[PDB]
Amino acid sequence: DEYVQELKGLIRKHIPERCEFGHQKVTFLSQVHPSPLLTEGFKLLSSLVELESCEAHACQANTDQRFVDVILSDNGILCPTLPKVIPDGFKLTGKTLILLETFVRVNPDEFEKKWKADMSKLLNLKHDLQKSGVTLVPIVDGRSNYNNRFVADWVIERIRWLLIEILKASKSEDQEYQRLIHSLSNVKLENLEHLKRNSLDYDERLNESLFIGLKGDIRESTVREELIKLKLWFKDEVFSKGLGKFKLTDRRELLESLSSLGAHLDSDVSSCPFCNNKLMEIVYNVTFSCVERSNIEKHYLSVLSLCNKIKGLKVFNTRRNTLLFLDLIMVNLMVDISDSCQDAIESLRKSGLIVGQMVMLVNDRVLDILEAVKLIRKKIGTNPNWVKNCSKILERSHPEIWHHLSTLIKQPDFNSLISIAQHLVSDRPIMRYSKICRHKLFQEMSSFEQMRLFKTLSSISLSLINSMKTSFSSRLLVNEFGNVRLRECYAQRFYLAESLVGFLFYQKTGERSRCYSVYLSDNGVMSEQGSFYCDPKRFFLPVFSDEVLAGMCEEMTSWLDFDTGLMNDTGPILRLLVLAILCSPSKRNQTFLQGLRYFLMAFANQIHHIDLTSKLVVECKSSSEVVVQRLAVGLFIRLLSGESDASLFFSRRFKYLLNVSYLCHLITKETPDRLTDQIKCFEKFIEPKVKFGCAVVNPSLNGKLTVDQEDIMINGLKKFFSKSLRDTEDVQTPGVCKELLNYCVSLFNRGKLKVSGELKNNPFRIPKLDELGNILSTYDKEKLVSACVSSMAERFKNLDPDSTDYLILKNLTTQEELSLMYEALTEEQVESFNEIKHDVQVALAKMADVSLHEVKDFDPDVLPPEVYKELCDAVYKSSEKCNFFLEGVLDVCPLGLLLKNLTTSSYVDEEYFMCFKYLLIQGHFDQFTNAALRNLCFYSEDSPTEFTSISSNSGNLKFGLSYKEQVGSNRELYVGDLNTKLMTRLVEDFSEAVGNSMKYTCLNSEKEFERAICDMKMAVNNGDLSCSYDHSKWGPTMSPALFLALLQMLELRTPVDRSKIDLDSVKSILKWHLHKVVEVPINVAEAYCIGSTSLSEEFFHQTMQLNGQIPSHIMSVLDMGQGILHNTSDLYGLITEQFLCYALDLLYDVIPVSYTSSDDQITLIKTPSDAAEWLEMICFHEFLSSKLNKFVSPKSVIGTFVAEFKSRFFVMGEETPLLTKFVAAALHNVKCKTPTQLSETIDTICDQCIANGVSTKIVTRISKRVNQLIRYSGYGETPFGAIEDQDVKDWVDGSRGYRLQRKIEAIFHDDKETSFIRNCARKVFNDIKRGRIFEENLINLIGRGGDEALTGFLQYAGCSEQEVNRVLNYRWVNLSSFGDLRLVLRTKLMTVPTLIKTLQSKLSRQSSVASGFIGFCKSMGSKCVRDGGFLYIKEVYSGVSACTCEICALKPKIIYCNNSLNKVSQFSKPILWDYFSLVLTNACELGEWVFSTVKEPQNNQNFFWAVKPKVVRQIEDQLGMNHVLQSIRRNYPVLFDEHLTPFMNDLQVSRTMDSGRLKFLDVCIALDMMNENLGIISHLLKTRDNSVYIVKQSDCALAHIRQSSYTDWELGLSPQQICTNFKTQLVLSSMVNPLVLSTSCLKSFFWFNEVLELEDDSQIELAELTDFALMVKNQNVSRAMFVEDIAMGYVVSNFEGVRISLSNVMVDGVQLPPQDIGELFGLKAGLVVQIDHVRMSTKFKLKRKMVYSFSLECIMDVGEIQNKEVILKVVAVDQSVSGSGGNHMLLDGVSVVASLPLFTGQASFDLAAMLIESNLAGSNDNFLMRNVTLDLGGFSPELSDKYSYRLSGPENQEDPLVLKDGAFYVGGERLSTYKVEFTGDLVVKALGALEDDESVVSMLHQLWPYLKATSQVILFQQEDFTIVHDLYKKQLTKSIE
């Protein structure tokens, strides 16, 4: 006993805190027996865990382990026959119970499983304990570790290790031991060999119905014969009879069909859009009434703002009296204004804000003054002390900040109010609920009323979204067929002119669709404009886009300027169509425009499907779609109709029609109704399965199927694989034939298709599912209410104020913070919050202690008001109640009486429904084996150890159904649990590895996508057959059984092992997926249960209670959830399309190439030897695809004029720009958290928009729009703000920093300060790069801030105090100076510089836009800006002094001076510092060409062309990772330790100086962290994403020419002088002694600046080759560098070949026995075609032009596949060069061996049984050569390009090049002398400092002999010669003579 005895002593360090601890310790220590030891230890550890865990929550440990019934029976509580459950911790108080069940699971999977299994068993008890008992709150304590608060967190793991060692030492079944060790480890993919895989007598029939026809060994020729016979049968049995699927166009018939389907003729609607649509009539009325025709108001608006602000404090705990105090204040101030200045109630009110007998009040409410004074008459006589209390309550316990000096305490004099009421007579609105046409004939109006129409529509949309902002917790004073006399309705205002305004009246609040009424007011006379009914959250697009739409339609119309007379008819039609589209948002319009797009696509080409016209019609309702459909059809006809002269310019027509059809992106996609969309999604999901007949009913969810379930499953599996190859009846039903599958498999296995199994890189390396879309699941509500009631019970150690509600606001997302956290909720969110509040309050009330609901759901919180009248509810709640209500409001709210307080607070208010609910809930109207007793404490019983063919002993792969929003129609969505998510992840990783091993598929490979793009473009330009095939129902039709059979039939051969990998685990996971369970949404279930003909509703009602229970779980055969098996489906489609293209190539002798995307494909067919003889081919292809599970949609098109792939249309010559799509994308998706991120998003969108040649005048309008949006929110304009205005075509070669710099430069007219700052930045750049002495000191100088850093940089460059006081005067207001703007926006429920966040995002791995922007504008009005505290934005902007000193007026509200911000100086930063930072950042980013000055320069709007960026980077262009990390670690150590690198295991490479001290990353990174709006480090680690820009020529000629000359003024070195001085130094250094011509004598010279001077277009004299080699960092030494005589060209081509040597040696046994060849030929004549190994040694004698020679031999090893009879089959090739040859020689050799008449081509192969006769020794022939030819891939082994002899060679390191007298000496022979000039001064400058005297002697004696080979007399014979005379060497100058 080693560890048995040590365990007793090691556990002695335990504290017996409770009695149970000691009581179990005395028994454990006094019992030494192996059989109970493990059990006792595990149970004592579990008791530790559970006791600590629950005692942390005010516990009472369950020591009896008794049931709930007995613990309820202890006190006096009746037994409702509750289900048996054993609780871990219980706490009973009054009539409330808290149950806590704790556990421990170290892995997230089993933890989530246990939590979701415990929450349900705790929740299913409340339904029985609440009906005739008490309430409860369930709590679940889940711990992912064995840690606690009793031990030092170091003994638990020791005890665990000792226990597992004792267990593995001795035991005492098979799986109970594997889970115990697994459930005590710490952390621990495929290869699940630990499983058992036991059979259950059911997988037998599965394998018998799945793998009977699968053989995968069919020959090649028999398939050819079968396809020939099938084609011959198809030609004369189904095609000659007229049962095809495609047909020719006959464009006239298509025009007639569109005119019949689109242009309605049997309709009663008129041909005028204004009198059909109500909104169009309204806007027409307003625009034709507007076009054809003072301290009082500001004081009123200020006091309106004050009262609206004070209303938000809710300091009165009541809504009625608050509004009464407010309108009292309002009427008192109104009568105080009307005391004098008689020209105020009529002049500054009628033209201001007042209407007939109505005044504006708080919360945008309009109230009648008669009703106002009448309600003021109340509260008097019965409560005369009201005004006094309300006046004395605003002084104490109040903010006490108010200007209500006299307008508050004044008693309202009623006589003056009556006089005012009699002044203006009642003219109240009518609120029209539920034939002559005079609408000016829009087609013939002026060019001014349409722009006014657009302006009015924009104003109306703004008014609508402003009505959307109305608060939710608002109730009118008095409540309310076809006409309602409005008196207390909500109203919004909008200004249109100088006097007339427009009023918008409505009665409801929230985000629902409402009915509105629009009125006008010219000079006080309130007229009537109309009424309508719409949804406010569907008009966000035109809020300010009144100029963008005008510009885009003007440009789209001018596109057709080729015929003067055609655009005049299409312009107004287009504008009216756009207008009608904006005024009527609907999905039907989007579907109609998509159908029109498909119609145009089919019209452009030559062949189209026969079922096309049935996919274009849509049922129109509300008579609003008729007009838009008629307009679209008329436009299409006007553009397409014509006999002969109808296609003068067809490209323009096609582009115009495409952009018109793409107008569907203007209408948003925000699910007009959620319940209907969910129902329709369920319909579309479950309809095909009911039609097929395999949808089973609720399974056991454990892996146990009944006999009928497995019977119907096998029946469906058989029906799936029961399709023949001849019957034409099954061409639209799912299923596949096994014969064609076996054919394709056997054809793919034997390397016949374009793909093979030669893959590399072996791939074997808490929400609820029943509710998706709900903001809060039941589990989260229950957890929140339990936590809150637990906190409130812990606090009571009574009385509780409303602060408990604050707790609800703290855990879901002090009156100010309460209001700030409460404003950020939506209508459904506030309803859920009220529900949670009600639950918490009733729970606390029960802790403190009509008959139609018992038979129905006994829940009182869900009783609907739609079953009872309102008069009964209003009269019953106001009855006699003595002990149910209490006197007073009782703000303190002690415990025990909260129920009465709630009833009284609800009764004093206006609403009585909550009063009735509280009244009802008050009236009490709701009344020793180790396998069974050891899996309840902490045993992970649900761990996977043994699985079956349908489950995994841990579930059945449950899923959840939902929808996803799209333009045309909603898409499906499946979300899974964690286990099935991991399984799908493994499957998709395996399949994506297999696909990445493939080539032709393009889904996660942009290279193949670009290849397909260029192939399609070339085919369209040449005129090949392009066929775009879209497939219908790809998701809901595929089945996992097809993939199972496919993977069973494949082999997946390894690259180098050829091992036939066993796909056992993959097939197991696929069998698991085949039996997945899809759970239906609960909303559809309730909608079909509560309760038009619907098939899925019929199935629901048929399966409701007939066969079983209500359907909640649906399993079937063919599901293939969309977005689950995407990669497997992609690979299957790829192989099927390869088989199909092979079949087509073999049958119709054409050349097909196919590209796939797992949903649609594109086939480019090159035909031999107009296109009317290919219908049989395409219909045969369609038939063959329908034989598989690849049904083609009628939207697929075949032609030769236009191609489509991934919504990218290519036509002859160019590409369609798709303007309107990008325009609508820019106008939409306004997601704003801060103005900076919105500016950046709009920047990216406008960049990618202008990339596709849109315009330069429209982007300016979008920038102005976003500027106005950020200004309207109350932020005010900032110098940076949104995208600059008045831009140019220089979005190319320009980033966000460049356009910010352009904006800042445009701020100043005559740039002298910014030019000086640019000069200082250029000086810093030169001194840091050329002078190159600056590092990490600028880091110390910049970290301070902006002011001192700028003057420090200036004094480093150079300045005086004048510059300090001059440049630093320009200031701008930065509101986010002491941090960021605090705000809580409309986020989902349940919840430091930015560079750190971007880096964290890089290392690591349903909401509307209108509501988001509304919440943004609302949250930008509270206390947001921070200091020291928080305050307002207008409070800061009100402190600026209007000095106006001729320097702060060049741009108001943008640039100020210093003394103008003396009141507020904390938010004041210089803009010139930001300009300096931006200039330096652009310099470190994209070159120094931005330091010069901007100069201005001195085309039919249709000349488009492509341009490329002209950027030049000096920042180490590669710039990968592990460089910014090192710079941060060096510069910011504390910032690198904290907030960075906890989630990193590769710190060693980032620490060992991986290319440390980058050129500029050191200083170009510190400006990014301090400035909050640069963002360059997050930009440098990103690609251009465009790489090309299509632009018009008209914008290229009007751009600014900003190209900088060299800052050194061309004065530095004149690189020609660099070259000549370097050559002079080299020649004079060589002419003192012989040196080798290696890199040792070229890099070792100072003037070798040739590696510098990035522009290397010109070399020195002759050394081009060695310079280009050094640019690649060559290690060469010397060779014959005589490129003057071309060694790469004019080379002998004496090429030949040799025999081969087969690997996998089997020939040595059959080589010698021939002594024959006959038996060998007979052996070569089961089939034994194995792999073939070819070995070749090709030796050539490549010569050169100069005197030289070279012998070069190449070894070629080819791994191919032996053929049956025809030629051969190839897999891979490899080459290895060798021999003696120069770089040019080997380059020529390797280029010609890859471009020779050899294997690539005719192969020039001479077999003749010759090389076989040499390998297989024999001297006989059998009169049969059977010549073969290779079809090699075309690999490119051209990666040496050096002097290297390619890793092998018998000759190395000879022929050294030396230099003695300026002449190349190869071995002693003179080649030539290159000319070098010195001009006299240079030679003496070199002679100055030398080694000794004899060196100078040698140099000057060898100089003139080299002068004989040169020509230089320019050496000045003057005083310089007298200086050279210092070296008295007359003999040297007199020896040459």
Nearer CB in complex with Zn ion: 1440/1736: 1440
Nearer CB in complex with Zn ion: 1450/1588: 1450
**CB 1127 within 8 Å of CB 995:** yes
CA gap 787, 798 in Å, rounded: 19
> Which token pair is 1122?
């969309």
**Rule CB under 5 A: which of 1157-1186 touch Mn ion?**
1160
Question: N- to C-terminal Cα distance for the chain?
Answer: 109
CB of 594 to Mn ion, least distance (A): 13
300, amino acid identity: Y
CA gap 1421, 1431 in Å, rounded: 10
Q: Which DSSP symbol is given to 1080?
A: P
CA gap 465, 538 in Å, rounded: 9
Question: Among Mn ion, Zn ion, none, what binds residue 272 when CB lies within 5 to 8 Å by partner kind?
Answer: Zn ion
- Candidates 1375, 1443, 1454, 1688: give the one binding Zn ion (CB under 5 A): 1443
Q: Is residue 88 a known part of a binding site? A: yes
Query: Phi/psi of residue 534, each to 5°?
Result: -150, 175
Q: Is residue 1457 a known part of a binding site? A: yes
**CB 1912 within 8 Å of CB 1879:** yes
- Candidates 10, 227, 272, 1599: give the one binding Zn ion (CB under 5 A): 272
**Rule CB under 5 A: which of 639-678 touch Mn ion?**
none
> Which token pair is 295?
């301290």
437 binds Zn ion (CB under 5 A): yes
Q: Is residue 50 a known part of a binding site? A: yes
Query: Phi/psi of residue 1525, each to 5°?
Result: -65, -45
Strands (DSSP E) contained in 1132-1252 are 1151-1156, 1160-1166, 1197-1199, 1202-1204, 1209-1211
Q: Is residue 893 a known part of a binding site? A: no
> CA–CA distance from 1222 to each of 659, 670, 1219, 1252 (Å)?
11, 19, 6, 9
**Rule CB under 5 A: which of 1215-1274 touch Mn ion?**
none
Nearer CB in complex with Mn ion: 833/1209: 1209
Nearer CB in complex with Mn ion: 53/1028: 1028
- CA nearest neighbour of 373 among 393, 387, 359: 359
- Candidates 439, 1017, 1579, 1735: give the one binding Zn ion (CB under 5 A): 439
Q: Is residue 275 a known part of a binding site? A: yes
Q: Is residue 272 a known part of a binding site? A: yes
Nearest 5 degrees, angle CA 133-CA 136-CA 137? 170
Question: Among Mn ion, Zn ion, none, what binds residue 346 when CB lies within 5 to 8 Å by partner kind?
Answer: none
CB of 495 to Mn ion, least distance (A): 49
Kindly determine how many residues on this chain lie close enough to bind Mn ion according to the rule CB under 5 A.
2
- Candidates 103, 146, 274, 1864: give the one binding Zn ion (CB under 5 A): 274
Q: Is residue 1204 a known part of a binding site? A: yes
Nearer CB in complex with Mn ion: 442/1034: 1034
Q: Is residue 1443 a known part of a binding site? A: yes
- Candidates 1448, 1577, 1896, 1915: give the one binding Zn ion (CB under 5 A): 1448
Cβ burial 963-979 (10 Å sphere, 16+ → b, else e) = beeebeebebbbbbbbb
Nearer CB in complex with Zn ion: 1063/1440: 1440
Residue recorded with tokens 């191609």: 1203
Nearer CB in complex with Zn ion: 1460/1526: 1460
State the helix-helix crossing angle for 1394-1403 and 1524-1531, rounded to 10 degrees. Answer: 140
CB of 580 to Zn ion, least distance (A): 13
SS3 state at 197: coil
Binding to Mn ion by CB under 5 A, coded x per residue (else -) over 994-1033, reads ------------------------------------x---
Q: Is residue 1417 a known part of a binding site? A: no
**CB 788 within 8 Å of CB 796:** no
State the helix-helix crossing angle for 1126-1148 and 1175-1187, rounded to 10 degrees. Answer: 140
SS (H, E, C) 1739-1801: EECCCCCCCCCCEEEEEEEEEEECCCCCCCEEEEEEEEEEEECCHHHHHHHHHHHCCCCCCCC
CB of 1160 to Mn ion, least distance (A): 3
Question: Among Mn ion, Zn ion, none, what binds residue 1160 when CB lies within 5 to 8 Å by partner kind?
Answer: Mn ion
> Which token pair is 631?
């307009």
CA gap 906, 916 in Å, rounded: 9
Return the range that interacts with Zn ion (CB under 5 A); candidates 437-445, 532-540, 590-598, 1219-1227.
437-445
Kindly determine how many residues on this chain lie close enough to bind Zn ion according to the rule CB under 5 A.
10
Return the range that interacts with Zn ion (CB under 5 A); candidates 432-440, 482-490, 647-655, 1219-1227.
432-440
Q: How many helices (H) and strands (E) does the chain have?
A: 70, 34
Q: What number of CA atoms fall less than 13 Å from residue 1275's CA on the CB side?
A: 26
99 binds Zn ion (CB under 5 A): no
CB of 1204 to Mn ion, least distance (A): 6
Catalytic, out of 114, 655, 723, 738: 114
1488 binds Mn ion (CB under 5 A): no
Question: Among Zn ion, Mn ion, none, what binds residue 439 when CB lies within 5 to 8 Å by partner kind?
Answer: Zn ion
DSSP one-letter string for 1595-1635: HHTTS-B--PPPTTTT-S--HHHHHHHHHHHHHHHHBTB-E
Nearer CB in complex with Mn ion: 545/1196: 1196
- Candidates 1256, 1460, 1573, 1775: give the one binding Zn ion (CB under 5 A): 1460
Would you put residue 1452 in left (φ > 0), alpha (ψ -120 to 50) or beta? beta
CA gap 1845, 1753 in Å, rounded: 10
Nearer CB in complex with Mn ion: 1008/1030: 1030
Q: Which residue is nearest to Mn ion (CB)?
A: 1160
CA gap 264, 628 in Å, rounded: 11
Question: Among Zn ion, Mn ion, none, what binds residue 1443 when CB lies within 5 to 8 Å by partner kind?
Answer: Zn ion
Q: Is residue 101 a known part of a binding site? A: yes
- Candidates 418, 931, 1445, 1547: give the one binding Zn ion (CB under 5 A): 1445
SS (H, E, C) 911-941: CCHHHHHHHHHHCCCCCCCCCCCCCCCCCCC
**Rule CB under 5 A: which of 718-777 touch Mn ion?**
none
SS3 state at 590: helix
- The strand pairing partners of 95, in sequence order, are none
Nearer CB in complex with Zn ion: 275/1832: 275
DSSP one-letter string for 663-701: GGGTS--S-S-HHHHHHHHHHHHHHHHHHHT-------S
- Candidates 11, 125, 275, 898: give the one binding Zn ion (CB under 5 A): 275
**CB 351 within 8 Å of CB 382:** no
Nearer CB in complex with Zn ion: 696/1455: 1455
Asked if 718 is an active-site residue, the reply is no
Q: Which DSSP symbol is given to 233?
A: H
- Candidates 123, 164, 1457, 1817: give the one binding Zn ion (CB under 5 A): 1457
Q: Which residues are annotated as a binding site for Mn(2+)?
A: 50, 88, 101, 1030, 1160, 1204
Q: List, as residue ranges, the binding site for Zn(2+).
A: 272, 275, 437, 439, 1443, 1445, 1448, 1457
Report, as residue numbers or ranges, the catalytic residues: 114
Residues that bind Mn ion (CB under 5 A): 1030, 1160
Binding site, residues? Answer: 50, 88, 101, 272, 275, 437, 439, 1030, 1160, 1204, 1443, 1445, 1448, 1457
Binding residues for Mg(2+): 1160
Which residues make up the interface to Zn ion (CB under 5 A)? 272, 274-275, 437, 439, 1443, 1445, 1448, 1457, 1460
